[PDB]
Amino acid sequence: VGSALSAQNIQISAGSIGSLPAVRGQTVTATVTAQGQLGTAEEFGNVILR
Amino acid sequence: IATVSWQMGTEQSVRFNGYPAMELSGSPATGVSTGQAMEAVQKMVDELGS
Secondary structure, three states, rough: OHHHHHHHOOOOOOOEOOOOOOOOOOOOOOOOOOOOOOOOHHHHOOOOOO | OOOOOOOOOOOOOEOOEEEOOOOOOOOOOOOHHHHHHHHHHHHHHHHOOO
C-alpha cells in the first residue's frame, strides 16, 4: 500500500521544448506540466494496489 | 492515455508573507499627497470581498 501510494502520487517535472541548446529553427518556447498528484479523497480511493 | 493540449499559464510565482501575491504599480496625480492616495487604494481594496 505504501509503494502504491508512493508510485501513483509523485510530483512530475517534465521541462520545456524551448531548451537552452536551442538548435536553429526555433521561435517558440512552452513549459510542459503534468499534475500527477491527488488532492481529494475520491481520487485516493482509486489507487491501484494489484 | 492523456489529454495533451495548449493552455495559458504564467512562468513566475511570487509569494509575499506566505500568501501568493501579485504586484501592482501606480503614481498619484498633481496636488494629491502620498497618504491620501494610500488611503484611497486602501478603501478601494477594502470595498472588495474577503
